[PDB]
């Protein structure tokens, strides 16, 4: 049993976006499918649900005006069409099956898909070394990218111990920035090469940055 959300991305305020929820491994039509969202760092918020067997929908009144939930039982898929998006609609959107007619609600969840509503445009990060000066610290500054997410690896994934990739923080420019750091033996700085591999999928940006003492 699996649920997979798709369609999340960057949308300008006032724009629209349709998300999808592909179900697998169970009779999709005879269980309610819910949409639940979670703004970054905030709580869970129930959006609404549909019974795919007959198309019956139920919305939290907050979204009844501009959100529309639908389902295609021939595709085992549910949809969330969102209109007139605002910045406060930025969230990870989950789809979740419930069994509310029996004993419990959300027993199966998808991984979630991120919807960012912002006037900021897609932009790949600049990558700058954080140069080391019996343990040393070094890293990479991953600055001025949008939207989330980015990934950082070290030495093409061969270096994982002691790595801290910090949560992105929104700058006053409306762009994200973070650092990824790692602690290593100071005796290794002369003979060990350290490279951060940065990937920002939304902009197709891939950057390898050699970090030298």
């Amino acid at each position: 049993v699996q649920l997979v959300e798709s369609g999340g991305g960057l949308v300008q305020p006032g724009g629209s976006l349709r998300l999808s929820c592909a179900a697998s491994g169970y009779e999709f039509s005879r269980s309610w499918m819910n949409w639940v969202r979670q703004a970054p760092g905030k709580g869970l918020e129930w959006v609404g649900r549909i019974y795919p067997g007959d198309g019956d929908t139920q919305y939290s009144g907050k979204f009844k005006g501009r959100f529309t939930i639908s389902a295609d039982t021939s595709k085992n898929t549910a949809y969330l069409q969102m209109n007139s998006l605002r910045a406060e609609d930025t969230a990870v959107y989950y789809c979740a099956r419930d069994g509310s007619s029996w004993d419990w609600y959300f027993d199966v969840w998808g991984q979630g898909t991120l919807v960012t509503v912002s006037s900021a445009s897609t932009k790949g990060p600049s990558v700058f070394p954080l140069a080391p000066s019996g343990t040393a610290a070094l890293g990479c500054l991953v600055k001025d990218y949008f939207p989330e997410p980015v990934t950082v690896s070290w030495n093409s994934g061969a270096l994982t111990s002691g790595v801290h990739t910090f949560p992105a923080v929104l700058q006053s420019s409306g762009l994200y920035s973070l650092s990824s750091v790692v602690t290593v033996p100071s005796s290794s700085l002369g003979t060990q090469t350290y490279i951060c591999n940065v990937n920002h999928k939304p902009s197709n940006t891939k950057v390898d940055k050699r970090v030298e003492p």
Binding site: G43, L44, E45, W46, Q58, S60, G61, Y94, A96, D98, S100, D103, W104, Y105, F106, D107, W109, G110, Q111, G112, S126, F128, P129, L130, A131, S133, T135, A137, G139, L141, K143, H164, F166, P167, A168, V169, Q171, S177, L178, S179, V181, T183
Partner: protein
């Protein structure tokens, strides 16, 4: 319409501790459930219909209550039980979640290791100077980072980021980034981040001299 209020909003408990989280509904709902959400993960159903453990949930989790007052109990907190816990009511439309209770692991005090990183020449050539101060593997979470530029305390030109508690050693790390224009950066020599933490007897200062 139905308001779900959890108490406390946050808690740090030691492994082995008895943990109790309460959920208070603004109206009687006599379908109360408890969900557990790891950072960066989807929520997982823990308790359903007030007191029933979902399949696979360890016996240390238990739920109780009635009417408007409900309690999630962890009889012996385990290292893998750190999460944000949400209560949820499915009795009255529209269905609502509690605001969440973030449970983190209380461990022994560890003072941060401090490092400072000057801006790169590559970034400077673009007209901006980012100075980064790193506080590594510390507990508890509270710490203060003060930027001093030629011994002048800075304000309004730095941003901090703190990691989620490490799943293995239960520590935090913190980054503080000082951002200056290239012109402002070139006007000063000494760049220092001064760190305090309850595990530090005296502030830790890491500094560099511009262009050295």
């Amino acid at each position: 319409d139905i308001q779900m209020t959890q108490s406390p909003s946050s808690l740090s408990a030691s492994v082995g501790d008895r943990v109790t989280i309460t959920c208070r509904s603004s109206q009687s709902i006599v379908f109360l459930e408890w969900y557990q959400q790891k950072p960066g993960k989807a929520p997982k159903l823990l308790i359903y219909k007030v007191s029933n453990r979902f399949s696979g949930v360890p016996s240390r989790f238990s739920g109780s209550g009635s009417g408007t007052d409900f309690t999630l109990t962890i009889s012996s907190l385990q290292p893998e039980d750190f999460a944000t816990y949400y209560c949820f009511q499915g009795s009255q439309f529209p269905y609502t979640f509690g605001q969440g209770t973030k449970v983190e692991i209380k461990r022994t005090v560890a003072a941060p290791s401090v490092f400072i990183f000057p801006p790169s020449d590559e970034q400077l050539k673009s007209g901006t100077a980012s100075v980064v101060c790193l506080l590594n593997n510390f507990y508890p979470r509270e710490a203060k980072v003060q930027w001093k530029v030629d011994n002048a305390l800075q304000s309004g030109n730095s941003q901090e980021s703190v990691t989620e508690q490490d799943s293995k050693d239960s520590t935090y790390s913190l980054s503080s980034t000082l951002t200056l224009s290239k012109a402002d950066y070139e006007k000063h020599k000494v760049y220092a981040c001064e760190v305090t933490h309850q595990g530090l007897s005296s502030p830790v200062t890491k500094s560099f001299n511009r262009g050295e």
